[PDB]
RNA sequence: CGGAGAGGGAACCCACU
């Protein structure tokens, strides 16, 4: 009638992704972890775009959308910021937003590529993902400019999570897999021989799927959390766990208050 | 069949031929509707084909029959012959914005003041 | 509100509804209600009328509400049925080998509105508690309903032989005391047919109870479909490659038979059928051979069909498709017809400039020996396009006649009604029938029955 | 016609049920005195439904026969369908 | 028009991969080698560049509205 | 001067005839635009091709319900003369 | 016989399995434009005043 | 034929036809003969040779064009007359070889059978694997799929202009698209579809979309609408563009006119909404009355650009184009390249959406119950070849009659990339995390977004504007009109037996009206309500007068009949 | 003015006989998609009366192989009457037979 | 124009309650828990943790409508045990599970970094 | 009051008052585009 | 100054179910 004891071991750690396995937990708990990974991990993305000039061939809302999809390096500032709906201030302050500026004009006859490098933040640590790639790769293109064309804009970056908009989704690919060999047979293969073996499967080439066990329960949940570049893949999981824990704590507080008010 | 056997045999044969096309598809239509159609098509002793040549000939009313393939010849004929429309149809009361005798309008509602004695108003 | 799809053909096209406010900007109606309206959700638009006076609001409430309009007086059948995912999922759910875990049973029962909060004793208590799909559909079925239906794949010899009341194939749906005892529920059980389970439910329990029955079926079955899943794929359309060889052999012998019939006709060795000329009897022989070949290839396709196939999982449930659709997808598209005959000689005594003159062979006159998987050779593609063009033209042309027929019928009978004398009279009180339907009985409250004392 | 000669059905048809309910709930909406003690419900249509179920609606129905005659059926006096 | 910033399905950043993809195609690299040289393992991300038509270049051939 | 004839785009006397893609872009025209349409009151107009029975050819038909069984028609036109299609029928009576 | 009517809306229909057969989903834009006339009574007078 | 094949005197378009059993030999030269090019076949061999193919492959340097190919006597233009008297072969390899002889007397061969298709039907992948009505519907809906319709769409001030943000050339394509330039101006996005029944919101031919993909820009588009106006028309009634000022101009809406500039127009880049003035135009009143153009109700866009110029009469002329982006919402009509149309039924976020072993969540989920009756096997083969192509790095080839690619080859190619050979995958439930018992068919398929958005069709009414002749509600979404309670809806209400509802629909909800009619003659009388003087001339009664409630259309029908000398007399007794 | 009126309105004839002259010619170019523009620029029309119960003109004829698209046609009351043009199908322009 | 705001999925209105508790009259020791502005993310874990308690006779969740933002959790427990205390024990056990998982995951990260 | 416009051809900002013929002071080109507005525009990145 | 909103119509064409 109590909680179970989960264990985690890391199978691969990289600036791009984290691959690991969680043991001795529930399928619902694992799915909710995978689900907070996509939905309820707050990051910093720009949500307020003011365009002072746009002579490009991509219109203003197109430019604003492409700007908003640009990830921003927010590893620790997202924890110390506040939601703009919760901050006591007016329109924007440094305590709940980050100002961005973009003033590019094409003057030479060569086509000018407006990239995320051209975005100048007010906070030096909250920047796009052009931070470090040494140990050649390009940067996120925004728009291309013809000679004489320009665009000037000022933007603010808010704190949000992927349930509002997909631009606050810190993860690119969250691989989820449990029971790679169909021992539980939660899925039914009409021809198991035609199905390729999973990466985490432990079977010889002779055998196609694990023998059925009626007593089995879903465990050994395999994750591969791939970061888009805003948060580190290792801290995405920590932030998701903290967010789920605080959400559960808030629900418990509301329930306790309601019960003590009903009694 | 009308020329050889008579109107009642016409009704049965018309029912059979009208059911043949519907049941040829395997679909079913209740006998209620086939009987009603074959009756209203043969309730006047002659073959009342459902056209402007059979529906407008019966003395239903100029207002009723000026809603179907008509509304000029019928109205001028009625004006010329001084015909009176009793307004007992449905498409006749519909034009004048009146309750058609069609259910919820086929009857009248009256107050039973004896049963009004009971009951009281509350704040 | 009263809510209709504009091409109103019958009184189950303008039906009352209760308004629920939903965020986005589209009308949303339940999927059983799709069938009466003839909706498709493929870009359909439906217009909604709000009764303004409270009198007419109450009138709509008491006359034209959709739960009250379940059974038509047109053919004394229910009009709404389980359709298009819920029907297939019910067929897959009420199978004999369907077992639900404790958590899954609780999740499904949470979607039952007419549930007493009492968990039934599972069909298996040990080694571990498992329920059955029929055991949950029994809770779904309201009140105490008793009906007996037969599944689509019910064999004929089963009733005559033994195992009559213990079905090996789990056919012969039997519902007793409001509880599904045995049988797999299909179109012929939960659809719009006469005497179906929903029809018995409407005739026994109230219209509101049958409304709740639709709601419970759809919610719980669509939520079990989250676990079960239902698809269709390119692998569902492939054969064993021995069935491919069988189909090729059937096609080849059919082509040889057509060729030898052509030879007999050319050498004047073919005797005309009495009542027919030589041309039409040759046409009859060719059509018989081609139709027999197509039927044999189709039957081979269904025999090769697997238990797990999604095409079969749809056609057996009757939600969508027919048994000839699988044949046209897998084995043979068929022979293309224009005005009932083979493809006519548009050119000079030939069909296309790729065929030799006076070529009566199956490939030269519209027969397509390829299926939708192997693709159509360009001649067959053109012939199939020309065949489907006929149906497309008919679809457009038929409307301007059928709607006119409907209007002309209505304008001849629009004032015929049942008076309080219980007789049937037109607008001028001329008696049409002394009793409605020459029995005085409503057409929506009758059933099909058998006269035992007859024969 | 007199009370002795009543040839119409003793069942309140669906059209009478709809129209009586509508025209009685309309009266309730215009603050007509209710014939049945209510338990706090405010919707005149539900009030009229409750009155119909309790057989207290102060309305009678005039059923016109085809010949021209009529019959006065009290709502309390004929059988309600539902 | 222009390459999307993120893959519609995955959400992996694809906006910075277009110019590098064209540069790799300006070599002996095939599309299948350029895509996984850029690190596109999932076909959801691969199609983002494989099926993209870059119409911004055709748009830039027109003189601007201002100067 | 007789008048001004509306002229089809990308035609042999249209101002966009034979121009290169760079020139078309300089003229704010689409190089991929196929042309073949008229600009009248600043609105693109496209002459839909109209079918008709071929001229100067003999057709023998047989209409079902008529006083004559077979009828042979040859609608005739000179080389784009002002006269319309002067159709002549040669027919045979049906007993 | 047929004519334009007030208090009528029209839009695209889309499926929704999570409501009963007697329910129909309508947008807030349509519901906020089409009106129903309620007669005031001492029962609903406070609710209608607040409305 | 010899002269026509060298273009000595007879040009290529001229067709020579020899009827053989009947001795006529006809030559046609007139205009309007429809014809297509065909290859020339001698004994059993084509005149097209490796040398022709080589010298034409190195084109743009040897300039050996199609005209030179025609001049070589390799191809001819054959119309229908000449097509009757000729023998064609579909494919030279398969139909010109030693075998059990069929013809052995061919005269022409087709270049490629896929050229029998048109323009909209040449974009269908695997069109011979579909039922023909599906192909017809796709050819019809290809004209409605939104995309970059032209490169110069920004200079093109045009009404009802639709462009998609991120068009993509299809992953699987026909070899005939490169000639339609479809890979340069495509209309659609290569979506990853999963043909599965997920929740039931796609049951009747509908579709689920990925909310996160839509947020990322999936099928997002912008709607261009242009507004034109010109000033002028009389001796003194001069039209002029200006800001209408309340004390000066008499007639004005409640709309705010501050958005206008003092010349009477809005500057581009200003947020606009329904019932907002765009062009302030006033006519002199013999003070002034405005004729300002209002933005179409419920548009709610942004002004893109404003152009001012002179028309051919030398008057000031203004056209204004307004941007309004259309984020894909539920109800928006989406379709594939196989006649599988459907409106979005629900939009789930990436978390709510099913997913593979990887994080791949389908952008689109369609009901599997749309395949078996429609029989769009081309759709399934497209969904398979799209995955094969997106994994291989190649662009898929879906030429109709290729015969070099089939389902078995595509499956074998797919099996090499670590996927099930038939395209099925094991998706996991997005809500519970349990893997779906059945395996889901999923892969990239080229879906199109059609112009039939729901925001352009939704409208309501509650006692809005009224027509002038008969006082019935107006017609049309733009005019805030009402729906037509037509003759069949009237019949349906009769069948329901809802007479009070029928009268409410046709009388109070459309045009309630009262008229006064004499009791002696059923003719309309004259009523002066304020003085309560009710007299019916022709009778001199003034005393017995009846008021009858009537539909205005009924009154106007009676007045028309009286104008036709008919006397409809309506006695209330 | 005659050319401009005829091409702008579609009434193919003198302005006095607006009802007599056949309409539908010179339609406004459909400029929603490039494929739509190409299809509208390659389109044929059969000037026979619509809403007619004679399906014979509407049917796809055998001589439509390679000159008229079999698939492409509107689904409304113009099935088979409005037909587009095949890809390599070319319409002769006429020359002197002398 | 009918599109609801994106923040509607998780933000309570003024006067709304995050949790609502209603006793179930059909069966004893049963209760319905209505949670506003939450979804499967919380409902599934709550249901799974409730199902581990042997004193819980019934536990399940549903979202009445995906367009709406609500979730209903019905809990039936054995007598002498309350559904409210069952729910709060499930929550306080799930929080402990998540905290332990956080500790173990960060330890695993630390030993994976050069270990 | 100023209402600066843009020539379509030479892209020259040229002053025009109210009720004047649409003319560019150079190049004689007769099609003018207005300007971009000065008021604030706020775009969500959604 | 009173919130003024009622804003022609005919024809043809395309398209949606
Ligand atoms: Mg439809």
PDB file of N, CA, C and O (backbone and C1' of nucleotides) and ligand atoms in Angstrom, chain C residues 5 38-44, chain L residues 17, ligand 1:
ATOM      1  N   UNK C   5     -29.188  18.365 -41.799  1.00  0.00           N
ATOM      2  CA  UNK C   5     -28.354  18.448 -42.986  1.00  0.00           C
ATOM      3  C   UNK C   5     -29.266  18.728 -44.172  1.00  0.00           C
ATOM      4  O   UNK C   5     -30.254  18.021 -44.382  1.00  0.00           O
ATOM      5  N   UNK C  38     -27.235  11.431 -42.803  1.00  0.00           N
ATOM      6  CA  UNK C  38     -26.393  11.090 -43.951  1.00  0.00           C
ATOM      7  C   UNK C  38     -25.143  11.962 -43.996  1.00  0.00           C
ATOM      8  O   UNK C  38     -24.650  12.310 -45.070  1.00  0.00           O
ATOM      9  N   UNK C  39     -24.623  12.321 -42.826  1.00  0.00           N
ATOM     10  CA  UNK C  39     -23.432  13.149 -42.757  1.00  0.00           C
ATOM     11  C   UNK C  39     -22.195  12.346 -43.143  1.00  0.00           C
ATOM     12  O   UNK C  39     -22.203  11.112 -43.171  1.00  0.00           O
ATOM     13  N   UNK C  40     -21.123  13.070 -43.458  1.00  0.00           N
ATOM     14  CA  UNK C  40     -19.851  12.433 -43.770  1.00  0.00           C
ATOM     15  C   UNK C  40     -18.650  13.087 -43.104  1.00  0.00           C
ATOM     16  O   UNK C  40     -17.574  12.484 -43.120  1.00  0.00           O
ATOM     17  N   UNK C  41     -18.781  14.291 -42.542  1.00  0.00           N
ATOM     18  CA  UNK C  41     -17.667  15.013 -41.921  1.00  0.00           C
ATOM     19  C   UNK C  41     -16.496  15.200 -42.883  1.00  0.00           C
ATOM     20  O   UNK C  41     -15.354  15.383 -42.458  1.00  0.00           O
ATOM     21  N   UNK C  42     -16.771  15.153 -44.186  1.00  0.00           N
ATOM     22  CA  UNK C  42     -15.771  15.380 -45.220  1.00  0.00           C
ATOM     23  C   UNK C  42     -15.863  16.794 -45.781  1.00  0.00           C
ATOM     24  O   UNK C  42     -15.645  17.013 -46.974  1.00  0.00           O
ATOM     25  N   UNK C  43     -16.188  17.759 -44.930  1.00  0.00           N
ATOM     26  CA  UNK C  43     -16.518  19.092 -45.374  1.00  0.00           C
ATOM     27  C   UNK C  43     -17.996  19.405 -45.388  1.00  0.00           C
ATOM     28  O   UNK C  43     -18.386  20.433 -45.954  1.00  0.00           O
ATOM     29  N   UNK C  44     -18.827  18.552 -44.795  1.00  0.00           N
ATOM     30  CA  UNK C  44     -20.256  18.812 -44.724  1.00  0.00           C
ATOM     31  C   UNK C  44     -20.532  20.059 -43.899  1.00  0.00           C
ATOM     32  O   UNK C  44     -19.817  20.374 -42.944  1.00  0.00           O
TER      33      UNK C  44
ATOM     34  P     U L  17     -17.122  18.385 -51.321  1.00  0.00           P
ATOM     35  O5'   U L  17     -18.470  17.894 -50.638  1.00  0.00           O
ATOM     36  C5'   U L  17     -18.667  18.064 -49.244  1.00  0.00           C
ATOM     37  C4'   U L  17     -20.110  17.881 -48.858  1.00  0.00           C
ATOM     38  C3'   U L  17     -20.837  16.710 -49.496  1.00  0.00           C
ATOM     39  O3'   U L  17     -20.532  15.471 -48.879  1.00  0.00           O
ATOM     40  C1'   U L  17     -22.216  18.633 -49.544  1.00  0.00           C
TER      41        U L  17
HETATM   42 MG1  LIG M   1     -20.038  14.372 -47.124  1.00  0.00          MG
END
